[PDB]
């Protein structure tokens, strides 16, 4: 999910 917030 981290990839959607970078």
């Amino acid at each position: 999910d981290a990839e959607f917030r970078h």
Partner: antibody
Amino acid sequence: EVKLVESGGGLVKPGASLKLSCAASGFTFSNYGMSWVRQNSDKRLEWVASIRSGGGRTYYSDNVKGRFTISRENAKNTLYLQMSSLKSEDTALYYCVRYDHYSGSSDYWGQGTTVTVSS
Amino acid sequence: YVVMTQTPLTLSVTIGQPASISCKSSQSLLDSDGKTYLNWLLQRPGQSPKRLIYLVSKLDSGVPDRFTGSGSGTDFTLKISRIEAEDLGLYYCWQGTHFPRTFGGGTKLEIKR
């Protein structure tokens, strides 16, 4: 009713290619980032690939990088996973998964499509 | 790769009784934005995974409030105040703080009869 329906799974030879589809309904698909997550025989979940709602930016696990391509067709409300150079270790139930940017986590999963890599 | 560890691996519970599951991560799940992306999921036999808890303690709106989540840093707990028959299945923790996304190995809850 948010619904995700994967298809395309089946038996594929080692080294060969296969394309999975995930048809989305019940929400505005183009607004959401999407991912594929796979589940193996041991019931272990492993994230595979992600694609943003904007700019077409994509992300891959070290296990599938350079072999798989995730893409989307917003006109068809559909997510794809193009698999190539498949191997036995790719055998799994493949799930389409929506990331909900409003709540801060992936929320909805599909029913999954089964990929069997075998000669 | 952030390692997620669940205990116990299996749980046999009587309907009506409480239960809990522990999730520990190999490094802090506190994000630079100040939020903690720790999630819980249930997969019933033959069914799709369904979200239970997100952001440590926020309850999915389709899930009853007998489910609660707590914790911080590296240590997290899912609590079920009262077990019901449909709770049978595989429970997973997973983190959305660090790339890549990583999941606990799962906890199997079965109903004691």
